[model samples]
Target chain A: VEKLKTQMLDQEELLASTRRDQDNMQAELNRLQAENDASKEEVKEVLQALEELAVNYDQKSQEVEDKTKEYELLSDELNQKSATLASIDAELQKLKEMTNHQKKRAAEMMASLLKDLA
Target chain B: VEKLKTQMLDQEELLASTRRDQDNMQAELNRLQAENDASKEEVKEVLQALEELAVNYDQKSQEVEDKTKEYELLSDELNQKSATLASIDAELQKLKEMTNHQKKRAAEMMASLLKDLA
Candidate 1:
């Protein structure tokens, strides 16, 4: 009887200590999760901004092109119409050059969010 | 004597449980650290991407500015030509007025690529 009583007491104490440890660990886990959440929000914002920016750029560029056709007709006889056309053409070329720039920027930005495997 | 033994056994068990809890906490810490390291890497990558984007923006914007200046110069020359054409058209109009039956429409839109100002 004495030995059995001792064993039960030992088990009870052991369980209590284990429970306390788990509680402490749970607290730490919560902290880590909170921090992770904040980090994720920041990343989300940047990506969202980038997406909106790219879309806006696309929309504005389309409008710019549409506005060009009318301008070109006037350009044909405007004596300096050729020069004006050349200048406008140059802007279009710049847009072309920026294609790769936008691509690289997008790739690099999204690459940062690739893995959360842990 | 029985109570004393029970208490002694409980203390020993408590010690053992505390040790296990310590071990678990240690493991959790290692896991958290690993997770934290990975998150840090992600942040680093994102920061690198942002840096790359900013650099591209800077370089491309500079090129755009340079190209714009040249385009504008070309446009100015075109504008000068356009002004001359307008004068000729106006003179042509004056001549047509003398013809009594001649009704020629002036070139209202010979070129419209003028939105390159911004």
Candidate 2:
């Protein structure tokens, strides 16, 4: 019958459309998974760089801290040496003045002796 | 009437299967996108740490790299003088290979950790 054939054609069309829809979903799923996989690799690389950064940072930071401490120690030692040198200069000036005063006194005594002998 | 009824049942089943498939795929897509977002944040954290590391390691790494460049230049001249000093190239190559290996290893390890964290 013509009606039976029309029914069969309608069913076939419905089936075909359903299959096409399913196929579209399958394709989308594939695309999503592939995109995910690609992003994962980039993510992994970034993470690796961070790990290396940590290691390098730890060692480098420690080295910097140690050098800072060393510079501080040297600075302190230089300050001590500078203070000692300043104090020694003060004492030396005082001794020089005392030597000049004694020389002046001795010269005056010798002049008086010569005057008396004359 | 019976044949049309049977065909109608078949079409309904096909439609149901297609809808279920769509639902399943949509759920999967949601999950993947969510996972992607989390992983992206993880990568963001890694990058942030890398930035911090750059700040921490700047002076030290710069000093080291400047010294290395000077050495490499001198080594090139030294190689012109005597090819035995090509050992410098070999030594640098070894250092690069070791750094690359460590980086790859760290990434792989972190990828596994991220998976676990997720």
Candidate 3:
């Protein structure tokens, strides 16, 4: 009977030890679960932030593209205007040359008329 | 003696069940740990990506800003060139008028000289 009681006590102690280990394991699992939850939340927030940044970056790239196009158009217009100015200058030079030739002919005519009248 | 043996068998079964429970808890804890680790790595990678995106966005914004400045300068230059073209057009118009007047005067002088000569 004494041996049976000792065996029962040993079983009780083993059961108690197993229960303690189980409790400790349960607590550790709970802690791990909480950490995983927190990590999930962090990842979610980071992804959201990254998405926002990507959107902003795309917008900025588009702005740069548009501005570059505008600059090209303006540059073209300036070049065309320069060509027009050059053409106008050429026209003015021709007119000046014609006027000067006419003035020289008029002066010659005047001198000839004066000599003929005299 | 039969009751004692029955009690011992029950204890063994209970211990086995508790150990099974502990083993399941350990598996769950391992799974949770792996999940947490994966989440941490994901967060780290996302943050790094976000940082790179931020840098690129900053560069894009600066590019846009620089392009805007260039556009403004080009616009100003265009305006000045337009003004210069206008001034040149005015000068060309004046020269045309002067040339036309001189031509008219020369024709009148020739006509007067012909009449006198006839």
Candidate 4:
């Protein structure tokens, strides 16, 4: 009877250890699951933020490109028109020189004709 | 002896169950580790992409703003230059008229002086 009692006590101790092992495994499983859940949440948030950033970045890139093109075109037109104005200024200067030459020639003619009349 | 045999059988059954439980726990741990590693990699990739996108977005936004301002300035300058061109044209027209009148006056004065010389 003592031997039987000792064997039974050994079995009981083994069962206790098994139970402890099972409990520890269950606790670890629970912790991992909770961590996975949190990680999933973080993934969702990061994905959403990435989507928002990508959308805005694409839009801004397109807008910047379009605006730069327009700016270049306008600057080109302004430069061309300024060149035309400069050319017109040169033409006006040439016309003024012609007017001075014509005035001098007419004055000379007038003085020669006056001498002939005198 | 029969009691001892029965107790030993029970202990064997418990041992099998415990071994199976441990195997299951190990499998679960591997799976969780794999899942955790995958999630970490995903998070890292997403975070890097988001950082790059944010930087580009800011740069593009500033470029758009600067281009818009430059476009406005160019347009204003073009309009002012166009106005100056219109004024120059008007001035040229007046000068043309003055040149025509001066030529007619000089012709009349020369004809009268030549008649007096005759």
Candidate 5:
């Protein structure tokens, strides 16, 4: 009879220990679930940030392209204007040479006419 | 004595059932832990992606700034060239007028010299 009572006591203690372990496991599972949910939320926020960055990058690219085009147009205009100025300078030089030649011819003719009168 | 034996058998059966329940709880806990770890890894990967995007955005922004500066310089250069062209054009026009006057004077002088000779 004593042996039977001892066996019963051991069985009750083992059952109680197992129940405690199960309770601890349940709590750990709940904690893990909560942590997993939080991690997922973080992922969602990061993805949103990535999307915003992509949009800004696209806008910046467009601005750079427009500025490049403006620079090219300005460069072309400067080149054309420089060419025109060079042509005008050449024309002025030609005109000056012609005027000087006419003046020299007139002086020679005047001197000859005066000498003939004397 | 018979009643004690019957009570001990009940206790043994109860212990076995509780142990089975504990085993099931342990398996659940391990599964939850694995799932939680996977979620954490996903979060880490997402954060890395976000970092890469940020770096690319910074590079793009610098490129845009450089392009803007280049555009401004080109615009300034074009304006200066245009002003220079205008000044050259005015100078050319004045030279043309002076040449015309010189040519008329030379023709008049030549006519007077020819008449005096005749």
Candidate 6:
């Protein structure tokens, strides 16, 4: 009878130990799975951030290139404006010099006319 | 007779395949057009965002320069205050020496008066 009781108790303890071990393993598995999920979410978030940054970079780069082209166009316009201004200035100077020469010629003609009359 | 039937089946299959191919091609063209429209919208959105950002940068830069000038002016004022404070300290020290000299002379007069009274 005593042997039977001891055998039963031993079997129960063995089963309880096994159950506890199984529970521990199950809890460990759950924890690992949760950690894995968390890591996956983190990676997903990182990927999304990278994708957004890439879009932003690409969009900004394109705008910069477009603005650079526009700047070149404006620079060309400025150059044309400058050339036109220079041409106008040159023309005005030429007209001034011609007017001065004409005035001198007129004075000389008047002097000759007076001398002839005298 | 078998050859005739085979030819008919081949023609039927070829016709069906051609029709399916046309449908597929048309669907593909529609999808491509949709993608093109989406790309155009994205480009426009990006351009608008860039313009807004440029406005922000311009305003912020202007504000920063304005603040910087203010800070410089304030720093100059602080320096002026520091110089004024040093001047006040010097005057305070001169006043303290004069007060100490007067106190010393008053104490000597009191002592002389006590001797005369005695």
Over A42-107, each residue of candidate 5 has an lDDT whose tens digit, in order, gives 545554554565577877656655554555565455556555555655665565566556556755
lDDT of 2 at B56: 60
* Interface RMS for model 4: 55.8
Stretches of candidate 2 above 4 Å error?
A: B1-118
Q: What ranges in model 5 sit over 4 Å off?
A: A1-3, B1-118
Residue-level lDDT of model 6, residues B18-83, one tens digit each, is 556555655665565565555555555665666776666555545545555555565555556555
Error of 6 at B1 (Å): 99
TM-score on alpha carbons, each prediction = 0.35, 0.47, 0.49, 0.46, 0.47, 0.47
Model 1 C-alpha lDDT per residue in residues B8-109, reported as the tens digit of each score: 567557655755665565566556556555655554555455555556655554555555555556545555654554565565555445432321111111
Local accuracy of candidate 2 as per-residue lDDT tens digits, A6-118:
65567557656755655565566556556555655554555455556656756876765665555556556555655555565566556556655655675565556556442
Per-residue lDDT of A1-118 in model 4, one digit per residue for the tens? 4555565567557656755665565566556556555655554555455556656767865665565555556546555655555565566556556655655675565556556442
- lDDT, candidate 4, B1-118, per-residue tens: 4555565567557656755665565566556556555655554555455556657777765665565555556545555655555565566556556655655675565556556542
Candidate 3 chain B lDDT trough over 10 residues, lowest sum:
B109-118
lDDT of each: 0.52, 0.57, 0.58, 0.58, 0.57, 0.57
Model 5 interface DockQ: 0.01
Top of the candidates by TM-score: 3
Could you tell me which 10 consecutive residues in candidate 2 chain B have the lowest summed lDDT? B78-87
Per-residue alpha-carbon lDDT of model 1 for A51-97, expressed as tens digits? 56556555555454444444444333343444444565565456545
TM-score of chain A of 6: 0.85
Record all residue pairs in model 6 with backbone atoms less than 3 Å apart, i.e. clashing: none
Off by over 4 Å in 6: A113-118, B1-118
Better of 1 and 6 by lDDT: 6
